[PDB]
């Protein structure tokens, strides 16, 4: 399945790549890093977890923003290959004020854009080079490049001329994109 794009009116004249780099610069940098993970404020969340489930979500600690990620997903901890996130995305939802976790799901109340039909794999044995590891942690570390390049290519996969520096309203006018109610 083609990926498919929801935007909030709001970002309709934003690149998709600016809106990444805006998101990622108000999300910033949870410091998920050795020394830096010491209590339970910047590891996120799954779904129903504690590894593994069907969801993961992580708010940032600098700003309201969160993001969801929906698949099948794992987390290896400490386990070799450790600190691995393994497994499939099919949904990416970025935004604020997240919701849900304790016997509801994770959900965003201002859900800003998701890109879903993503169909991203990971094997465990991939270790932290796996797709589904670079974009969700880089998402976590204030980098949205892997994300960035993963919906190029998804686009791009659809028509040479469809691409993250398309805006939302270009993607709509193409028939991928669609605003949400
Ligand atoms: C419940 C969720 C999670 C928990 C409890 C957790 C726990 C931890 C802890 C405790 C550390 C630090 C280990 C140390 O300082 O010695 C760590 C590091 C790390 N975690 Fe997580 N983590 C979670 C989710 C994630 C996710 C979703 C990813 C990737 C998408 C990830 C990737 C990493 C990476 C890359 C490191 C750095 C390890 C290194 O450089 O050696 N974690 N995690």
Redesign the pocket.
């Known amino acids: 399945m083609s990926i498919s794009i929801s935007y909030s009116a709001t970002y309709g004249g934003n690149t998709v790549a600016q809106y990444l780099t805006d998101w990622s610069a108000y999300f910033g940098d949870v410091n ?6 010491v209590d339970g404020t910047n ?4 779904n129903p ?3 593994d489930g069907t969801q ?1 979500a ?1 708010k940032s600690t600098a700003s309201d923003a969160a993001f969801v990620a929906d698949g099948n997903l794992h ?1 290896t ?1 400490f386990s070799n290959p ?4 393994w497994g499939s995305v099919d949904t990416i939802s970025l935004g604020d004020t997240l919701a849900g976790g304790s016997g509801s799901n994770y959900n965003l109340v201002s859900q800003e854009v998701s890109f879903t039909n993503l169909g991203l794999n990971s094997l465990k044995e991939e270790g ?1 080079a796996g797709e589904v ?1 670079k974009v ?2 880089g998402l ?1 570390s204030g980098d949205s490049s892997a994300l960035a390049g993963e919906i190029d290519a998804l686009l791009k996969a659809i028509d040479p001329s469809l691409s993250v520096n398309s805006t939302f309203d270009d993607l709509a006018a193409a028939g991928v994109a669609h605003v949400n109610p």
């Not at 590891?43 to 799954?46: E, Q």
């Open positions: 998920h890093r050795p020394g830096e993970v590891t996120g969340g799954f977890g504690p590894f993961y992580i987390y901890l450790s600190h691995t996130l932290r590891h969700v942690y976590m």
